[PDB]
């Protein structure tokens, strides 16, 4: 009765933790996505740049 | 009363599992992205050197 109630409290605590990690891992990904985009354009500008030298 | 809360426990456990699996997938996503980033930086280095090879021939 008290054990069941505390166990629900533990479960809901851990869940809140795990989804905070999900929010953190998504933050890390969005940052890496900005970098990917930055690199993709530099790659594109390097390809154009190359045809300009020919 | 006793079986109700125990059923809720079971449900919460499953969500826990679902969330931990999502964390596992997300970490895989990052590793798969990090690898692409590697291939990308390598290509940026090679295409930069290709352009310096032409900027040195003409100049």
Number of H/I helices of chain A: 1
The strand count of chain A comes to: 0
The two chains with the largest interface, and their residue counts, are: A-B, 31 and 32 residues
Kindly provide the name of the CATH class of chain A: Mainly Alpha
User: What is the CATH topology of chain A?
Assistant: Single alpha-helices involved in coiled-coils or other helix-helix interfaces
By oligomeric state, this entry counts as homodimer
- Calculate Rg of chain A over CA atoms: 24 Å
Listing every helix as H and every strand as E from the N terminus to the C terminus, the arrangement of chain A reads: H
Main pleated sheet of chain A? none
| 3D shape of chain A | rod-shaped
- Going by CATH, the architecture of chain A would be Up-down Bundle
Q: Please indicate the count of domains of chain A.
A: 1
Structural category of chain A is: mainly alpha
Distance N to C terminus of chain A? 80 Å
Tell me the fraction of residues in β-strands of chain A, as a range.
Answer: under 5%
What is the percent of helical residues of chain A? over 70%
What does this structure look like?
Two copies of one chain form a homodimer. By secondary structure, the first copy, chain A, is mainly α. The first copy, chain A, has a single domain, classed as Single alpha-helices involved in coiled-coils or other helix-helix interfaces. In chain A, 94% of the residues lie in helices and 0% in strands. Chain A has one helix and no strands. Chain A has one helix at 2-52. The longest helix of chain A has 51 residues, at 2-52. The interface between A and B is medium-sized, with 31 and 32 residues. The PDB classes it as protein transport.
């Amino acid at each position: 009765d008290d054990a069941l109630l505390n166990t629900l409290a533990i479960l809901q605590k851990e869940l809140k933790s795990k989804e905070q990690e999900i929010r953190r891992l998504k933050e890390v990904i969005a940052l890496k996505n900005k970098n990917t985009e930055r690199l993709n354009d530099e790659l594109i500008s390097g390809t154009i740049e190359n045809n300009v030298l020919q």
